[PDB]
Ligand binder design. Sequence first.
Ligand code: AIO
Ligand code: AIO
Lengths: 651, 651
Amino acid sequence: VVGLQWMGDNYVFIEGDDLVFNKTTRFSAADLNALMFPSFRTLDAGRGLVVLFTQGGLVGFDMLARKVTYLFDTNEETASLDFSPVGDRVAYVRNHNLYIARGGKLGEGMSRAIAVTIDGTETLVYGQAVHQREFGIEKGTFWSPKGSCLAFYRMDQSMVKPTPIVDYHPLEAESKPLYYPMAGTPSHHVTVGIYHLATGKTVYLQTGEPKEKFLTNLSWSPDENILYVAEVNRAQNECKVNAYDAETGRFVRTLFVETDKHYVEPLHPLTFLPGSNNQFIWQSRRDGWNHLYLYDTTGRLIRQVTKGEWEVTNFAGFDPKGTRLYFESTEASPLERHFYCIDIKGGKTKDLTPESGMHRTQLSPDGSAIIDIFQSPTVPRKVTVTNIGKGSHTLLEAKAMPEIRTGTIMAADGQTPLYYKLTMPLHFDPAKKYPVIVYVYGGPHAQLVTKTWGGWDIYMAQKGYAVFTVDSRGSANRGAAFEQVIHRRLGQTEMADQMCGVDFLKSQSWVDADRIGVHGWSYGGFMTTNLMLTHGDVFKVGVAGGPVIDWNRYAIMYGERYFDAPQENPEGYDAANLLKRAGDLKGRLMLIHGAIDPVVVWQHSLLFLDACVKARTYPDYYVYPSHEHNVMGPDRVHLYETITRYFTDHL
Amino acid sequence: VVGLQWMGDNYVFIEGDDLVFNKTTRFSAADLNALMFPSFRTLDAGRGLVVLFTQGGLVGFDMLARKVTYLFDTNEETASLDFSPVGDRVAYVRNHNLYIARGGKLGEGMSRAIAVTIDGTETLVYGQAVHQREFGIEKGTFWSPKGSCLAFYRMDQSMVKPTPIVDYHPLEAESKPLYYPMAGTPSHHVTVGIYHLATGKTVYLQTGEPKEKFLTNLSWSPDENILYVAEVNRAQNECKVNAYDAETGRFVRTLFVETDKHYVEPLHPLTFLPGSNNQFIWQSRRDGWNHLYLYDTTGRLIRQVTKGEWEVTNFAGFDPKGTRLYFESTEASPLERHFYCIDIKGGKTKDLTPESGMHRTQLSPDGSAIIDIFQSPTVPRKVTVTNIGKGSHTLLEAKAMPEIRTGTIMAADGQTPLYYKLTMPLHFDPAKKYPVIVYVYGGPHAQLVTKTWGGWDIYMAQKGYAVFTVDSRGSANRGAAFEQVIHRRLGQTEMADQMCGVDFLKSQSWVDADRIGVHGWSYGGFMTTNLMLTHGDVFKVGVAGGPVIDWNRYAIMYGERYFDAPQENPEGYDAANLLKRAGDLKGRLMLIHGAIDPVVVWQHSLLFLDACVKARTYPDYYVYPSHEHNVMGPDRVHLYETITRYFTDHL
Ligand SMILES: *[B]([O])([O])[C]1[C][C][C]N1C(=O)[C]([N]C(=O)[C]([C])[N])[C]([C])[C][C]
Ligand SMILES: *[B]([O])([O])[C]1[C][C][C]N1C(=O)[C]([N]C(=O)[C]([C])[N])[C]([C])[C][C]
């Protein structure tokens, strides 16, 4: 059901040719083409306003009125586009600087874009994501809700020592500095500008010292008078939610402060109640579980709205009156996602999607209805549309492969339940012994085992290899205690729990205990390498892609949260520094890296090979010179074949 | 016999503790230590003047007088040291600039070095090798024979587009540009300065246009009035030997010009006859074979001194009177090296080292005697000392391993004999079938098969693998016709001849024709890869180290000699461009590269892996991040084990 979404009070989808509306009407590509089924980006679901990407600029389109809105000329920039909530202007970044282009109405001619900044360059970045995209930061432009102002980040990274990123395709290779701030080093300096459209004036927030402070979750007041910022200290154990005057940039007040033994991690903006300039919802994991908190703008906590030993995983919004909250959570089970209603006064949740498994739900603009997309181990796809507190309507339902087994084991503490998935060999025979590969990630913010319906496990299984994954402690959606055990000690608990997975595998009669392998990417590449070095008698063969190898060389804003700074934690960093234990490699391990990886710099795997040379140990290697952190697109076929053949050759 | 050499009329060697002199006297490390067995560099064999490298500077020492000469302070620079023939000054390069330090006599105090240049930097190089060390160029400083002047290269490479060379060892990796001028691109601009010690004045040779001309084989007149230069054009098919006035830098005259259908390649300086400012010996391959030619300084050729279908391989010098020439050549056999005498009037050579095999010979300062070091397949080491035209005296003689077989096959023309060596499996059994690896180089200036006594072949042989090498056409010491067949067509003839080697192997009953592999480094890495892609049905497994893959990315001064320029020869370059045929890889090939390789830039192997990704083919890889073109020192053990295990795993 291509593009299933809300447009006004209609739910909408594509039929290769038509856009179909239901509350039935149909809008074809030729109907549309006459007014200039293609791709679009929805800008305003309530109004069904979208933008169409065409040869020769952007065309805004009102799908409810069936009328062109505006033509935009952004000099071919698309990545950084951020349309005003008014819908008639768009911000974007081009050749280092921030611009605003105004939409032009059909046959009324165009105006030249406004340059918000003029001194952007390699070490001075405007209007883009900062702080290595930590703290929920995905972009660097933030329109005020009435379109009067454009707030934006200014990142001076001139003090950061860069890493070369080399393009090998020109005749002579060309390097460009990547200002990647490594653990324990000087951070970049971010400030927040606000460009006022009426006056063309810019003011900077007076965020003050230390200049390294992290400026996160920018959130405008509904009346546009105040810009709120969640400021996080370098230690990452204090978050202050502060109000700044949008007119002058002056500090107004600190609403509240959160602190934690290990770390605080704000990830979501303040969300104001409907029709209110004075009350908002703030997400916080302060009580050990991510919950919704109701605050007024003086900083006074009215009440914790949600509570329980489960986590809110998506805040979807309010009823029109702002007396109810809608949200996705783990309340039913950490392996599941359901959509709920709760009174703003708190109390009992009501599960609006009760069936056991994974629900992905979209609340209608008017808050009256939901689109639900469901899948489970027995149900490939069930698409429903429901009038909340009324009838439900099914729109679509779907109905030798490797067998997938699931269950629970105890973690190394002997108390915490861990959930696993096991992809069995194709045509598995219980009388036979099989090799098995532990596919591991194990890092924060991910959860690999859910009650659901990129298939590398199935490919391995088709080659006669079982694939086992377990979500060890450190992993997500199980509360802060379950995650924070890793603090200052990366790899230690994670590997202990992965070895409980191995204990379970060895308890299976059909497992060949002498043919156990391991594979993972990124944090999973760190884990793969660490497991081979630490448990060299168990793990015969592994493949580690884009692996972290020396945490001192990972980015400040992620690494120092989980590990603290290298100066504060030499014992922990040293224990996880795989360069120090390269002489423990006694099996077959291939490392793979994208050469232009700006997340885990190529240096990590290169230094490991260098360490292995000195240590006289013998890893294998592959480099994708055109790829960044992950191998994307058709080349992923080459990746899977390289990884698979390594295991079929050696394990 | 450590350090065997001439000092005055004595032959000399070390005995761990003593320096022993014979014409017998002995000089111990304690005798020497009292005057301040250690290492030294001999500066003047006739006078037995040496330099000793010590903590706190250089100490010049007269071994015949047993006296310190001078103390030198070169601010710890050692690589670029070039001592004046007078022995009391030394030139060197430090922080981009050329200096001359004067020696200080014991207890007479020291003087500050003189700065010859002051504006050296990354794009302006002084006193170093230029033209990528082609044309016999090994250094960039050239003292006049009486020490009155210091000539030096100035290389402006500001027009060359650089390649990043990345040091991965700092916390954040650090790149430095390498001004490596690739085939068909703008070359660097070399001029020659002459610093006059008496006046402190510098003059530049008026070498003129084109500024890209190659300035080679700088050779001072004995009277210091003229500096001769062999100038080579960009096409490399014309060499002009020109005289310049040392006082003014003005052009004086062109002595003679050499031209060739394919290429001219001057490799040696003019060597003046003893006591003569008017006659010199010039080496030239103009008649198809490297020979010695007698010229006067007007440019008039007196006579070709040596001639024949063999090559002079080392010119050792003259009798004191300058009526005879001494030299090493292939006259006995291209597989052998003997030392000869010939009258300056020419005619018959006399072989002074008649025994069949490899002789390495040192003519005494007075030209009366020779030290000879001999080895052959039956003789590991025989060291002789002979009074020419008188008695000879033996000083030393040396006396399950893999069997080494040698023989001849016909090249692909069916006419030219090729010589091969075959290292048999350890404990070879004629009833058994064995895998075999062709170890290939095949490029110009090398000859791998000689009648002699780094052992990778023996290691492979010990693992049960035969190793076969054949010197295909293109290879050295067989005359110009045998080499120049490759011109404009790199890889084509070489591979045709290597396939004659395969034909020979397949004719052996003990060869397993389905288990043939190939290995080589550099040009041999190009050949390994090319053979796998071209003859994929034959070569099952290969390992290619520091391989050339795209000749457009090799250095101008070597590549354009053998291949012409890419614009002049698209058909030839395209045929050898292994990036275009990466989809033909159907066996197992590991490429290996030193990351900081300044000879074959790392880009070659990286782009091949990138080509294989697009082509969906599957090479393997290893990178030595701390190594340049070859893996040197203890790490070479790791290299051999990586290469060997690849073959034992897959072939
Ligand atoms: B990996 O697992 O993809 C990589 C190494 C460990 C963390 N990591 C990430 O990509 C994380 N993002 C960041 O580090 C951002 C770029 N700062 C992901 C997994 C989100 C936590
Ligand atoms: B290799 O075979 O080591 C490399 C690639 C082909 C030629 N080559 C060389 O190292 C040659 N020297 C140069 O290219 C110099 C550095 N310009 C050697 C073999 C001498 C001919």
